[PDB]
């Protein structure tokens, strides 16, 4: 009979991805302005190169200065022969600098449980001192259909990402784009077109599932790194719906993610003014008052606190 | 089973006018309004130190004022507070039979409603209350919307379910301090042009689906900007389109707007009756489908037209 | 488990042409159409008094007409009617093996499909029918959408699921008499100007997710205004974008429109093949990600490309 | 927030079965002392005779005087080609004297829902004035595993029987007997054998499921009609666990079922004395007191009423 | 991925019940050898005396020296008008000496949740320093049918009792006795009768539900307080199945319960010998060995520890 | 649906002979026994310090020894231990194709099995293993029996489920240090005389029901007192009566006992065939029920008789 479980307090404004098969770029990633680093063994690495990428990543975890980055590795999916070797090698060979693993293409709670079972055993066997957190990608029809059970699937779970590329493919969406506006998704009214959000339910359901269970909801990749305004629009929708951050799949997207997912000065100012107004009303024996011609009440305090919390971390 | 979905309560619910229990001067004004439902508030419009006085005010008003034919409801405090049980005990022990309903806020699962039901049922039996209260709830949290159907099925007392956009936004972590309505940062970019979309679509549609499945009235909640009448119309129109049957007024100005939108227009009713006539005429010719104004109407159109008619003849 | 989602039926389902069984004159025209699937109707396009005769007409048509390579389906009456059992018994006892499929309307739970499955299975065994029927259902009620996934997993016979916007709107209590498409009162107001949004988004997306999870074909239902080609294109395009693989035609003119929208454009197919080419080249360079026209493409892009190509090459 | 829903108040001490293919038995069954009559289309009727059995039963429903007896027909199972014809013909051809149908081999709630769907449609189409009630047999591993959902499967459902023959076969029990003691089910203690109840859970779980949902739990066939004392033991176990009656598969078993499932005057006497004792205790301001060296309290009232209710039936 | 959650470590060998309407007995109860005291507001107290009993109990909680007894109160059920008054008065008026509340006739998890909602609110409102634990009674068809969900229903939940009197009534069992042997529940073999356990499933299922979720399973009242040997048999059965204690409804039953539910010196000796034997085997590089002509292995260690654990508390 | 329960594996499973992997001298003796299934143990018969060596021994034994036609299984360590993952990896990366099965102990939910399935499936694919392993599990905890049905349905690989009375007793908190069999303190008192009852009844029956529902073989576990032949026979006889198809042998002597009890006697088979013959004759007379030795036999009796004959003809 308390409120929502609090999610992890750590910053998660941007998760910068890089293929494990390009170790020369690891230093640049560590030096970036991204909160989270995702070294990839999955869909940015060709099958013949996954063994080498695995070796590269283990070496980088043990050898590089990762500063204050939250260090995550995306392993291969449970429908592949690679996943078990990813987990075993990482947990048997990588030092304690590794923070987290990301599980792709999650379709049910049991998927997460399976990884948890293996990871827990190796951590115990090898006497690992820093237990890994988990993050997952909802990027299939099964994933979104079972989104709440997945959100509740492990005490290790800290974050859940939408993967619009795999999601579109799994859903059979007629597009080769990764996130963003869809040309053929619009409303016709009086001869004019009005574009609508083809991702609404997927993103909102993920947010609801995450907040219910104390997980961070995160927006995934936006493919068009040549389109800053397009990225801003996608990030803005996500931030509005309750997602706390977004992937960067290109160095330029890091600043854009940090821009959108850090509340503006004006937003923070209004938030504090609402808090001040409600405190004043409280002293007058009132639980509701008027702010700029609109209603504010006790619920507004919680809303204002959402803004301030994201700005103060 | 093997019948159509359960019919919801047939009472009017176009507008629910809210007022803080700590401002008893508003009570007679609320009683005089054109609102179908009255919600005397003990929760989020009332500061903590004023909750006891508000409870006393409300009980006295339930017993003392002429409430006409309005459906009288009280929003109690949430189950995550120390206030809720005293709200329920005092109301059920001291309020007369003019009280019709209580509103449970921040409902996260069916068991929340069951808990209030258990308490209310016991006191009604102990006091020999002749008019059993109905319940209404607010879906205004991540847990709430995630568990929306089980909540809709949670009690025989349950008559209505409202979306609470303010608490919903806070719960979901939505980057906004507004209450319902258009969100500036929720738009589609297309060829340099912005196209605003509905950031509340799923939540509202899911509430409607859960309610209609289990014979509950789906209702839209507060719209914060009482200076923005067209914004209210837009929000109310979206809700009415999705299947919600009414909307809160948190200011007297909003009652007229709610009644305007949630009462089907003459034009809409006229078309509905024309469609009903068209289908009856088609039925006589041995047809279950026909053409009306260049479009298809069939047996399903009868049910749709009856949705328009029903809300108008109430 | 530990495989990709089950593959849906490989058959074309770009358009399902509907016609009332009480109008046998339409039958040969439907057989001559360009529709992938034919739906002979016993339900909401047929008046109650004509349903018995419509049943007889349809049985004659199944046994007598040249249906070519059309997938032949019959929409029976709902389980909340006295007609449904006579539809199924007569069809399965009297129709020959040309019948491919039965469509069940107004499905609200998995048990509805199980019930029809139980009866159909018994008759097929009793009469030694050589070609067991496939099933398709309509999600067209609040209960249907609330229980969409369990319905999608309800039978090994199930091949397709349609959204029925007319009955869905009526069931949801949506204030409209239109069938699908833009709703005048569903828009966002931003700085004094309106921006229309999709009032069907969740229902459509949830149906697609349910279907793709369980190897079913998600299909868009009727668009009422057969006088509005561009409106049809808009609706069909939204559906195609979300992952639905076809759309009903309730008028001959809509068949060409459906085939057009649900067959990927040459431009779209061209880009897909270019992406596939780019990704193979990247593989050879020891890369699982590369750049295509200023955009990221990776291993997932291969799957997206294959969605386009697969649908174009059928 | 009330007590468990009340089951049907009609007597169900004994259900007398007879094959539909042996219509000479019908008038004898109608003249018996059995509360319920079950005319059989299923496992007592060979496949080639089922169509004629169906015709015989319809004739008997419409032509015989069944007095005050509750008239039921056991149809064929949902895994057979026969069931649909059974239901269609019964509801389209039989008059309103038919009270009930028994569905065999029920494995899940959806099985009962399927029959309900068909039955409801025909009753509406033909304007039948007396809607049928349902009863089912739990006689498979799936049946007992899903016993509660089956008990809640239909507002038509009035009774649930255990079918020990099919249950044994389904469970793979090493026996060819029908109910009763099993020679190989005993406890060995210091060289002595003590026979135990191999049907305990199945019977108890059926009672629990039924009472939870307002259904009558009933014991099924006892095969050895040459063994009166064996029948008595089986019937007594069932009555003790809470089952309200038992099948008769031979005329001799009817009197035995009525004997066991009608509470003895001794039992009724004790119950009334306990009831009187509790009333006297309440007058003294006591909720508990002593009866024959035993504790009795407010719970004892409910127990005594269980006895009396079945006696005044 | 650990062992099942440990139940509360406190002793619970005997729960001595007494009606709240007889406060003259409270001192005798406090001085008894019972681990837990249950002051009753329910079925041992007549309806008209429930108000006075409530006041009596609140006074006794605040006034009596309860030593080290675990102090619990059985409130009225959720299907009565009394329950809310019991809870409100107890939590608003009784001091911090109260340890626990017993909820009778529980039929689902939501029942426990309902009481938890009320209790939690009052504790917060009144600033109660010691949060109450909960215990419940499984004593209805719905209760046993939903026994696992009930066991998982609240973090407060510490114990679950079988209530054989209400259970028998709810199930429609033909008896007026409370627990123990049932005359009509026996197996007939070669003209000889062999009595079996009519309570087996109910008791075993309660134990399983409790041990799964870290709850103590407890046996309920035995009615015939004139029958020491009958009590011993009932207690021995419960102890064998895994119940950790039993109600006393008469002073004489306290010593009996303590006798049976404290492992005998012989039993403890064998346990320690098995532990010693297994330690010796481990030193020889063995995980299994022979003890008194039988197999003992790693599992035997856990079994021996069950014995020792109960003896050492 | 609409078919009888799924058939379990047809292979013999009358006895599963266990032996610790840390005693390789036993291996050839086990291979020469009359047991249908062999269980090489890495778990509770092997001390923690000896588990690595046991693993090496067993892998070498799988590849090196002639196991004839016996079904070869290995019991791995539990998912609550650090050993289990190394057990599975080494077995699947190093053992040849002679390995048939692995046994998972202390299973508490379906997800436990799914977890092992996930790991096993990946290694089989990575190594191109030609014969996919089957799974068997042990129900030997409170959670295990509480969730027995979901566990039985947890994997397509699952072929058998055993009751583990030692761990079950410990988990349930049973006051005993014995393994299976009569419990001295579990009896009914009646008129001064004691009558011992089955303290394992529900656990065994529920396991049988879960298995038969989902086409799994239910098996009885270890009986600890190998000095007590009649105790074993009694325990095995109870299990065979409830529907379990075999039993563990934890000592060579027990193999003969298990085969004795779990092979139907000639008397039992003769009666079964006589009943089948009687029912055949009844069918010819136009009867579905008749009399056999003063008792009723009908169509259900045919299935019962077939249960006896089937176990005899393995
Ligand atoms: C999109 C991508 C393929 C483009 O690669 P590219 O053609 O070499 O990119 P650019 O030329 O525009 O890179 C600009 C600079 O940033 C570096 N850079 C490229 N990708 C980087 C990354 N992911 N992280 C950090 N630095 C990166 C480049 O090496 C180059 O450095 P320089 O200035 O010293 O020359 C590349 O950014 C990439 O691999 N993306 C991440 C893919 C991934 O991990 N996807 C996850 C699944 S969606
Ligand atoms: C109980 C146990 C420790 C007794 O060992 P023991 O003292 O050597 O047994 P015995 O001396 O009576 O054995 C008799 C003979 O059978 C052999 N034997 C013992 N256990 C055997 C087994 N499990 N399989 C095959 N042969 C076995 C012995 O080697 C000996 O053979 P021999 O005549 O050539 O000398 C041993 O049987 C054992 O480990 N059992 C299996 C334990 C197990 O796997 N349990 C896990 C599941 S609960
Ligand atoms: O994982 C991804 O990059 C995706 O599918 O969106
Ligand atoms: O209940 C409310 O006012 C809200 O939070 O929207
Ligand atoms: O089935 C239909 O035509 C509908 O309701 O949309
Ligand atoms: O139905 C029956 O007779 C049975 O199988 O017990
Ligand atoms: O609570 C009790 O005493 C009972 O019903 O057994
Ligand atoms: O696994 C075992 O041997 C047991 O616990 O019975
Ligand atoms: Mg992906
Ligand atoms: Mg609110
Ligand atoms: Mg329709
Ligand atoms: Mg049978
Ligand atoms: Mg009781
Ligand atoms: Mg074990």
mmCIF file of N, CA, C and O in Angstrom, chain A residues 43-45 49 79 141-142 146 165 169-178 184-189 194 196 198 200-201 223-224 226, chain C residues 2 5 149 182 184 196-198 201-202 205 208-209 212-213 230 237-238 240-241 243 271 286 288 294-296 298-299 304 307-308:
data_model
loop_
_atom_site.group_PDB
_atom_site.id
_atom_site.type_symbol
_atom_site.label_atom_id
_atom_site.label_comp_id
_atom_site.label_asym_id
_atom_site.label_seq_id
_atom_site.Cartn_x
_atom_site.Cartn_y
_atom_site.Cartn_z
ATOM 1 N N UNK A 43 22.891 -7.530 -33.406
ATOM 2 C CA UNK A 43 22.510 -7.154 -34.770
ATOM 3 C C UNK A 43 23.372 -6.117 -35.499
ATOM 4 O O UNK A 43 23.041 -5.717 -36.615
ATOM 5 N N UNK A 44 24.470 -5.684 -34.891
ATOM 6 C CA UNK A 44 25.418 -4.843 -35.615
ATOM 7 C C UNK A 44 26.688 -5.624 -35.939
ATOM 8 O O UNK A 44 27.639 -5.073 -36.487
ATOM 9 N N UNK A 45 26.694 -6.909 -35.593
ATOM 10 C CA UNK A 45 27.852 -7.770 -35.831
ATOM 11 C C UNK A 45 27.475 -8.990 -36.671
ATOM 12 O O UNK A 45 26.584 -9.756 -36.308
ATOM 13 N N UNK A 49 31.707 -12.945 -37.337
ATOM 14 C CA UNK A 49 32.546 -12.056 -36.535
ATOM 15 C C UNK A 49 32.173 -12.027 -35.053
ATOM 16 O O UNK A 49 32.806 -11.323 -34.265
ATOM 17 N N UNK A 79 17.146 -17.431 -29.353
ATOM 18 C CA UNK A 79 16.832 -18.268 -30.504
ATOM 19 C C UNK A 79 18.068 -18.519 -31.370
ATOM 20 O O UNK A 79 17.965 -19.054 -32.473
ATOM 21 N N UNK A 141 6.164 -8.882 -31.818
ATOM 22 C CA UNK A 141 4.746 -8.963 -31.492
ATOM 23 C C UNK A 141 4.550 -9.649 -30.145
ATOM 24 O O UNK A 141 3.770 -9.186 -29.310
ATOM 25 N N UNK A 142 5.268 -10.749 -29.938
ATOM 26 C CA UNK A 142 5.196 -11.488 -28.683
ATOM 27 C C UNK A 142 5.642 -10.614 -27.517
ATOM 28 O O UNK A 142 5.027 -10.627 -26.449
ATOM 29 N N UNK A 146 3.252 -9.423 -24.376
ATOM 30 C CA UNK A 146 3.571 -9.924 -23.044
ATOM 31 C C UNK A 146 4.413 -8.919 -22.267
ATOM 32 O O UNK A 146 5.219 -9.300 -21.417
ATOM 33 N N UNK A 165 13.071 -1.301 -35.237
ATOM 34 C CA UNK A 165 13.465 -2.017 -36.448
ATOM 35 C C UNK A 165 12.935 -3.450 -36.429
ATOM 36 O O UNK A 165 12.191 -3.857 -37.322
ATOM 37 N N UNK A 169 9.548 -5.337 -38.324
ATOM 38 C CA UNK A 169 9.703 -6.574 -39.080
ATOM 39 C C UNK A 169 8.812 -7.674 -38.518
ATOM 40 O O UNK A 169 8.147 -8.393 -39.266
ATOM 41 N N UNK A 170 8.800 -7.801 -37.195
ATOM 42 C CA UNK A 170 7.989 -8.818 -36.536
ATOM 43 C C UNK A 170 6.501 -8.577 -36.749
ATOM 44 O O UNK A 170 5.738 -9.516 -36.966
ATOM 45 N N UNK A 171 6.093 -7.314 -36.676
ATOM 46 C CA UNK A 171 4.692 -6.947 -36.844
ATOM 47 C C UNK A 171 4.257 -7.030 -38.307
ATOM 48 O O UNK A 171 3.063 -7.065 -38.608
ATOM 49 N N UNK A 172 5.228 -7.065 -39.211
ATOM 50 C CA UNK A 172 4.934 -7.097 -40.633
ATOM 51 C C UNK A 172 4.606 -5.715 -41.170
ATOM 52 O O UNK A 172 3.901 -5.575 -42.171
ATOM 53 N N UNK A 173 5.113 -4.691 -40.494
ATOM 54 C CA UNK A 173 4.914 -3.316 -40.930
ATOM 55 C C UNK A 173 5.570 -3.092 -42.288
ATOM 56 O O UNK A 173 6.719 -3.477 -42.500
ATOM 57 N N UNK A 174 4.836 -2.478 -43.209
ATOM 58 C CA UNK A 174 5.378 -2.193 -44.534
ATOM 59 C C UNK A 174 6.270 -0.959 -44.501
ATOM 60 O O UNK A 174 5.858 0.134 -44.889
ATOM 61 N N UNK A 175 7.494 -1.150 -44.020
ATOM 62 C CA UNK A 175 8.478 -0.080 -43.943
ATOM 63 C C UNK A 175 9.872 -0.667 -43.769
ATOM 64 O O UNK A 175 10.030 -1.773 -43.248
ATOM 65 N N UNK A 176 10.883 0.071 -44.217
ATOM 66 C CA UNK A 176 12.268 -0.307 -43.959
ATOM 67 C C UNK A 176 12.948 0.761 -43.110
ATOM 68 O O UNK A 176 14.162 0.730 -42.905
ATOM 69 N N UNK A 177 12.155 1.708 -42.622
ATOM 70 C CA UNK A 177 12.663 2.747 -41.745
ATOM 71 C C UNK A 177 12.809 2.247 -40.321
ATOM 72 O O UNK A 177 12.230 1.226 -39.948
ATOM 73 N N UNK A 178 13.593 2.962 -39.525
ATOM 74 C CA UNK A 178 13.769 2.617 -38.120
ATOM 75 C C UNK A 178 13.228 3.739 -37.246
ATOM 76 O O UNK A 178 13.899 4.746 -37.024
ATOM 77 N N UNK A 184 2.921 6.532 -44.989
ATOM 78 C CA UNK A 184 1.599 5.968 -45.248
ATOM 79 C C UNK A 184 0.710 5.865 -44.013
ATOM 80 O O UNK A 184 -0.333 5.216 -44.052
ATOM 81 N N UNK A 185 1.121 6.503 -42.920
ATOM 82 C CA UNK A 185 0.293 6.544 -41.715
ATOM 83 C C UNK A 185 -0.187 7.963 -41.419
ATOM 84 O O UNK A 185 0.480 8.730 -40.720
ATOM 85 N N UNK A 186 -1.355 8.300 -41.953
ATOM 86 C CA UNK A 186 -1.896 9.646 -41.845
ATOM 87 C C UNK A 186 -3.415 9.587 -41.888
ATOM 88 O O UNK A 186 -3.989 8.587 -42.319
ATOM 89 N N UNK A 187 -4.060 10.665 -41.453
ATOM 90 C CA UNK A 187 -5.506 10.791 -41.581
ATOM 91 C C UNK A 187 -5.831 11.749 -42.720
ATOM 92 O O UNK A 187 -5.243 12.826 -42.819
ATOM 93 N N UNK A 188 -6.763 11.350 -43.579
ATOM 94 C CA UNK A 188 -7.238 12.225 -44.640
ATOM 95 C C UNK A 188 -8.461 12.983 -44.151
ATOM 96 O O UNK A 188 -9.457 12.380 -43.743
ATOM 97 N N UNK A 189 -8.379 14.309 -44.176
ATOM 98 C CA UNK A 189 -9.515 15.140 -43.806
ATOM 99 C C UNK A 189 -9.657 16.313 -44.762
ATOM 100 O O UNK A 189 -8.760 17.150 -44.862
ATOM 101 N N UNK A 194 -3.020 14.423 -42.429
ATOM 102 C CA UNK A 194 -2.544 14.710 -41.081
ATOM 103 C C UNK A 194 -1.873 13.469 -40.516
ATOM 104 O O UNK A 194 -2.535 12.470 -40.248
ATOM 105 N N UNK A 196 -0.065 10.778 -38.108
ATOM 106 C CA UNK A 196 -0.337 10.327 -36.751
ATOM 107 C C UNK A 196 0.777 9.389 -36.287
ATOM 108 O O UNK A 196 1.603 8.954 -37.093
ATOM 109 N N UNK A 198 2.309 6.055 -35.412
ATOM 110 C CA UNK A 198 2.078 4.628 -35.645
ATOM 111 C C UNK A 198 2.718 3.776 -34.553
ATOM 112 O O UNK A 198 2.588 2.553 -34.581
ATOM 113 N N UNK A 200 2.312 4.621 -31.140
ATOM 114 C CA UNK A 200 1.742 5.082 -29.869
ATOM 115 C C UNK A 200 1.543 3.992 -28.817
ATOM 116 O O UNK A 200 2.072 4.091 -27.713
ATOM 117 N N UNK A 201 0.767 2.967 -29.160
ATOM 118 C CA UNK A 201 0.453 1.907 -28.209
ATOM 119 C C UNK A 201 1.706 1.197 -27.716
ATOM 120 O O UNK A 201 1.872 0.990 -26.512
ATOM 121 N N UNK A 223 16.890 5.471 -36.990
ATOM 122 C CA UNK A 223 17.828 5.141 -38.050
ATOM 123 C C UNK A 223 18.446 6.307 -38.800
ATOM 124 O O UNK A 223 19.636 6.286 -39.121
ATOM 125 N N UNK A 224 17.643 7.328 -39.079
ATOM 126 C CA UNK A 224 18.091 8.444 -39.905
ATOM 127 C C UNK A 224 18.954 9.432 -39.122
ATOM 128 O O UNK A 224 18.469 10.470 -38.671
ATOM 129 N N UNK A 226 20.958 11.404 -40.250
ATOM 130 C CA UNK A 226 21.120 12.621 -41.042
ATOM 131 C C UNK A 226 19.975 13.598 -40.789
ATOM 132 O O UNK A 226 19.948 14.690 -41.352
ATOM 133 N N UNK C 2 12.358 -20.870 -28.715
ATOM 134 C CA UNK C 2 13.707 -20.577 -29.197
ATOM 135 C C UNK C 2 13.777 -20.610 -30.721
ATOM 136 O O UNK C 2 14.817 -20.891 -31.317
ATOM 137 N N UNK C 5 8.892 -16.289 -34.430
ATOM 138 C CA UNK C 5 7.441 -16.443 -34.379
ATOM 139 C C UNK C 5 6.950 -17.359 -35.498
ATOM 140 O O UNK C 5 7.550 -17.401 -36.571
ATOM 141 N N UNK C 149 -5.608 -11.488 -27.707
ATOM 142 C CA UNK C 149 -4.550 -12.492 -27.795
ATOM 143 C C UNK C 149 -5.048 -13.917 -27.557
ATOM 144 O O UNK C 149 -4.646 -14.835 -28.266
ATOM 145 N N UNK C 182 -11.502 8.433 -41.066
ATOM 146 C CA UNK C 182 -11.349 9.635 -40.253
ATOM 147 C C UNK C 182 -12.628 9.949 -39.484
ATOM 148 O O UNK C 182 -13.727 9.837 -40.024
ATOM 149 N N UNK C 184 -14.504 13.034 -37.640
ATOM 150 C CA UNK C 184 -14.487 14.495 -37.598
ATOM 151 C C UNK C 184 -14.153 15.038 -36.211
ATOM 152 O O UNK C 184 -13.428 16.026 -36.081
ATOM 153 N N UNK C 196 -6.061 16.058 -37.220
ATOM 154 C CA UNK C 196 -6.777 14.800 -37.050
ATOM 155 C C UNK C 196 -5.845 13.624 -36.765
ATOM 156 O O UNK C 196 -4.779 13.497 -37.365
ATOM 157 N N UNK C 197 -6.256 12.779 -35.823
ATOM 158 C CA UNK C 197 -5.443 11.653 -35.378
ATOM 159 C C UNK C 197 -6.199 10.343 -35.577
ATOM 160 O O UNK C 197 -7.390 10.351 -35.885
ATOM 161 N N UNK C 198 -5.507 9.222 -35.398
ATOM 162 C CA UNK C 198 -6.099 7.907 -35.645
ATOM 163 C C UNK C 198 -6.848 7.374 -34.427
ATOM 164 O O UNK C 198 -6.232 7.016 -33.420
ATOM 165 N N UNK C 201 -6.125 3.388 -33.672
ATOM 166 C CA UNK C 201 -4.733 2.951 -33.576
ATOM 167 C C UNK C 201 -4.495 1.695 -32.738
ATOM 168 O O UNK C 201 -3.921 0.720 -33.226
ATOM 169 N N UNK C 202 -4.915 1.729 -31.477
ATOM 170 C CA UNK C 202 -4.674 0.612 -30.568
ATOM 171 C C UNK C 202 -5.352 -0.668 -31.041
ATOM 172 O O UNK C 202 -4.728 -1.729 -31.079
ATOM 173 N N UNK C 205 -3.382 -2.044 -33.975
ATOM 174 C CA UNK C 205 -2.050 -2.496 -33.589
ATOM 175 C C UNK C 205 -2.097 -3.741 -32.702
ATOM 176 O O UNK C 205 -1.271 -4.643 -32.849
ATOM 177 N N UNK C 208 -2.824 -6.782 -34.805
ATOM 178 C CA UNK C 208 -1.629 -7.192 -35.536
ATOM 179 C C UNK C 208 -0.654 -7.945 -34.628
ATOM 180 O O UNK C 208 -0.120 -8.985 -35.009
ATOM 181 N N UNK C 209 -0.435 -7.419 -33.427
ATOM 182 C CA UNK C 209 0.482 -8.043 -32.478
ATOM 183 C C UNK C 209 -0.020 -9.418 -32.050
ATOM 184 O O UNK C 209 0.754 -10.373 -31.963
ATOM 185 N N UNK C 212 0.451 -11.778 -35.231
ATOM 186 C CA UNK C 212 1.837 -12.099 -35.542
ATOM 187 C C UNK C 212 2.463 -12.974 -34.457
ATOM 188 O O UNK C 212 3.335 -13.795 -34.740
ATOM 189 N N UNK C 213 2.008 -12.804 -33.220
ATOM 190 C CA UNK C 213 2.480 -13.637 -32.119
ATOM 191 C C UNK C 213 2.108 -15.106 -32.337
ATOM 192 O O UNK C 213 2.879 -16.006 -32.002
ATOM 193 N N UNK C 230 -10.079 8.018 -52.045
ATOM 194 C CA UNK C 230 -8.914 8.517 -51.323
ATOM 195 C C UNK C 230 -9.010 8.207 -49.834
ATOM 196 O O UNK C 230 -8.002 7.937 -49.184
ATOM 197 N N UNK C 237 -3.862 2.274 -46.202
ATOM 198 C CA UNK C 237 -2.445 2.574 -46.009
ATOM 199 C C UNK C 237 -2.044 2.522 -44.539
ATOM 200 O O UNK C 237 -0.972 2.016 -44.203
ATOM 201 N N UNK C 238 -2.899 3.050 -43.666
ATOM 202 C CA UNK C 238 -2.656 2.962 -42.229
ATOM 203 C C UNK C 238 -2.565 1.504 -41.799
ATOM 204 O O UNK C 238 -1.655 1.119 -41.066
ATOM 205 N N UNK C 240 -1.906 -1.159 -43.722
ATOM 206 C CA UNK C 240 -0.724 -1.771 -44.321
ATOM 207 C C UNK C 240 0.534 -1.394 -43.548
ATOM 208 O O UNK C 240 1.428 -2.220 -43.358
ATOM 209 N N UNK C 241 0.592 -0.145 -43.096
ATOM 210 C CA UNK C 241 1.732 0.338 -42.328
ATOM 211 C C UNK C 241 1.846 -0.388 -40.990
ATOM 212 O O UNK C 241 2.941 -0.738 -40.560
ATOM 213 N N UNK C 243 0.754 -3.357 -40.231
ATOM 214 C CA UNK C 243 1.086 -4.760 -40.408
ATOM 215 C C UNK C 243 -0.053 -5.649 -40.876
ATOM 216 O O UNK C 243 0.122 -6.857 -41.032
ATOM 217 N N UNK C 271 13.804 -0.245 -52.950
ATOM 218 C CA UNK C 271 14.592 0.141 -51.788
ATOM 219 C C UNK C 271 14.963 -1.072 -50.942
ATOM 220 O O UNK C 271 16.089 -1.175 -50.450
ATOM 221 N N UNK C 286 33.030 -7.652 -43.142
ATOM 222 C CA UNK C 286 33.084 -7.981 -41.727
ATOM 223 C C UNK C 286 32.284 -7.000 -40.891
ATOM 224 O O UNK C 286 32.689 -6.637 -39.784
ATOM 225 N N UNK C 288 28.164 -5.804 -39.592
ATOM 226 C CA UNK C 288 26.763 -6.149 -39.446
ATOM 227 C C UNK C 288 25.882 -4.916 -39.449
ATOM 228 O O UNK C 288 24.671 -4.997 -39.235
ATOM 229 N N UNK C 294 22.280 7.849 -45.974
ATOM 230 C CA UNK C 294 22.353 8.685 -44.789
ATOM 231 C C UNK C 294 21.645 8.098 -43.583
ATOM 232 O O UNK C 294 21.473 8.779 -42.575
ATOM 233 N N UNK C 295 21.243 6.833 -43.685
ATOM 234 C CA UNK C 295 20.551 6.150 -42.596
ATOM 235 C C UNK C 295 21.324 4.922 -42.144
ATOM 236 O O UNK C 295 22.110 4.359 -42.902
ATOM 237 N N UNK C 296 21.083 4.499 -40.910
ATOM 238 C CA UNK C 296 21.615 3.234 -40.428
ATOM 239 C C UNK C 296 20.799 2.081 -40.993
ATOM 240 O O UNK C 296 19.568 2.126 -40.999
ATOM 241 N N UNK C 298 21.013 -2.322 -40.501
ATOM 242 C CA UNK C 298 21.700 -3.411 -39.817
ATOM 243 C C UNK C 298 20.985 -4.733 -40.064
ATOM 244 O O UNK C 298 20.179 -4.839 -40.983
ATOM 245 N N UNK C 299 21.284 -5.734 -39.242
ATOM 246 C CA UNK C 299 20.743 -7.078 -39.441
ATOM 247 C C UNK C 299 19.211 -7.114 -39.376
ATOM 248 O O UNK C 299 18.568 -7.894 -40.084
ATOM 249 N N UNK C 304 13.239 -6.466 -42.206
ATOM 250 C CA UNK C 304 12.276 -5.481 -42.689
ATOM 251 C C UNK C 304 12.166 -5.544 -44.211
ATOM 252 O O UNK C 304 11.065 -5.583 -44.761
ATOM 253 N N UNK C 307 10.185 -8.431 -45.378
ATOM 254 C CA UNK C 307 8.743 -8.234 -45.226
ATOM 255 C C UNK C 307 8.155 -7.618 -46.496
ATOM 256 O O UNK C 307 7.112 -8.055 -46.989
ATOM 257 N N UNK C 308 8.842 -6.611 -47.027
ATOM 258 C CA UNK C 308 8.415 -5.941 -48.252
ATOM 259 C C UNK C 308 8.449 -6.897 -49.438
ATOM 260 O O UNK C 308 7.458 -7.053 -50.152
#
